[PDB]
Design a protein around this ligand. Structure first.
Ligand SMILES: CCCCCCCCOCCOCCOCCOCCO
Ligand SMILES: CCCCCCCCOCCOCCOCCOCCO
Ligand SMILES: CCCCCCCCOCCOCCOCCOCCO
Ligand SMILES: COc1cc(C(=O)[O-])ccc1O
Ligand SMILES: COc1cc(C(=O)[O-])ccc1O
Length: 374
């Protein structure tokens, strides 16, 4: 039922951000999600809403929008609604939403999430197979209260009438393997095709995983961001045992151009994605090593750590070719497991970025999040 199965989730997010090239930002966010149930019947009808509000505290960062003078706003926010309609094992949503698909990953790396306006269909009528398609015609950046036309990261000022997509994922092999094929079009800017293989296999105490991906990009229509021809391949491999996980990522961009994506979106579909980049400059070859540990092994349940290092070379940028870069990320995340503060999450992380072709910097973040649900 519409009211029966309705859930309300509120996240309080206190976010401290520092980048030393020392510049600083501190802010408080509120993210309110109201998700109804569905009316009973052949066509079920529902409504989702999202409320976003951020407040500047005394002190990228992209935590808050900037005034024209370059001064961060005191506060910002917006409210979005989406209607939902369900039939059998298929759903259509229309309005404002948070798309999380391989060709369009909504960003939530700062204070409030990026949202999009459009429609999205997910259909699971045949066992193991999920079909998706949709179109988004406006976007609100993570650091903006407003909606604007979409554009590509490679030319953020060149606007498009919208982003269309369709894709399929098939999961099989006792749920261990998944294949994905996706096609997207940012109208008059670029078209992108993507294939993905996910696989996991247990060898004794080890869990071995692979995430292989291939993107192929070209300009579309009027080609407002210029001519584009790119392909990007990555393989991200994991080996887990007990409380430990090890990763090796390998990636290469080829062709005339870098890898394409929608401006403001997250780079997290890419194998070597890290906090401050994903090594997708034209021609760039990169590798990554990563280690994760679950500190329950030291009597600290709820504490998890990650360290990762990535290096890229052969990078072509406007300035020149043969560019090199590296990033090192470290994170400790703690989630309170029990007591009055249960579910409270504290994440502390640090990134160091060095680039032969751009500015070097270190970055420190502390994010304290508390979820309430009723
Ligand atoms: C599928 C696996 O991906 C194949 C492409 O990976 C290329 C290997 O990258 C070489 C890393 O060395 C250069 C890093 O600076
Ligand atoms: C400027 C670098 C300071 C980082 C020191 C390391 C502290 C956090 O590391 C936790 C490693 O977790 C292991 C996984
Ligand atoms: C993994 C370690 C990396 C090393 C980085 C150094 O309510 C919440 C209160 O907020 C507490 C934070 O506010 C203080 C920031 O000012
Ligand atoms: C628009 O409101 C919502 C959107 C979403 C989303 O798209 O995932 C989730 C919960 C919401 O309350
Ligand atoms: C000269 O600047 C850099 C060089 C390298 C390298 O040689 O691996 C890496 C990152 C850099 O920022």
């Amino acid at each position: 039922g519409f009211l029966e199965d309705a859930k309300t989730d509120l996240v309080l997010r206190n976010y401290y951000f520092n980048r030393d090239f020392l510049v600083d930002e501190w802010a408080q966010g509120f993210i309110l999600k109201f998700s109804s149930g569905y009316t009973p019947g052949t066509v079920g009808v529902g409504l989702d809403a999202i409320g976003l509000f951020g407040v500047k505290l005394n002190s990228n960062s992209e935590l808050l929008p900037l005034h024209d003078d370059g001064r961060a706003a005191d506060n910002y926010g917006r409210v979005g609604v989406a209607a939902k309609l369900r039939v059998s094992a298929s759903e259509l949503k229309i309005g404002e939403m948070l798309p999380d698909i391989p060709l369009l990953r909504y960003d939530d790396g700062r204070l409030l999430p990026q949202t999009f306006r459009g429609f999205a269909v997910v259909s699971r009528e045949l066992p193991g197979l999920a079909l998706q398609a949709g179109r988004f015609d406006a976007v609100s950046l993570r650091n903006s209260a407003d909606m604007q036309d979409l554009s590509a990261w490679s030319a953020p000022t060149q606007k498009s009438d919208g982003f269309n997509y369709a894709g399929a994922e098939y999961r099989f092999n006792r749920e261990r393997t998944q294949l994905g094929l996706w096609h997207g079009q940012l109208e008059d800017v670029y078209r992108q095709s993507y294939a993905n293989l996910l696989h996991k296999q247990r060898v004794g105490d080890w869990t071995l995983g692979a995430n292989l991906g291939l993107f192929v990009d070209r300009d579309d229509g009027a080609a407002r961001a210029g001519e584009i021809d790119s392909h990007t391949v990555y393989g991200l491999f994991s080996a887990g045992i007990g409380l430990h996980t090890f990763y090796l990522g390998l990636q290469k961009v080829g062709g005339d151009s870098g890898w394409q994506s929608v401006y403001g979106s997250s780079g997290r579909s890419m194998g070597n994605d890290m906090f401050n980049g994903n090594f997708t400059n034209a021609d760039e070859r990169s590798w990554q090593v990563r280690y994760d540990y679950d500190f329950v092994g030291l009597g600290w349940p709820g504490l998890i750590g990650m360290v990762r290092y990535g290096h890229g070379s052969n990078a072509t940028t406007k300035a020149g070719s043969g560019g090199k870069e590296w990033e090192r990320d470290v994170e400790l995340g703690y989630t309170v497991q029990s007591g009055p503060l249960a579910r409270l999450n504290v994440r502390l992380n640090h990134a160091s970025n060095r680039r032969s072709f751009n500015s070097d910097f270190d970055q420190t973040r502390l994010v304290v999040s508390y979820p309430l649900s009723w």
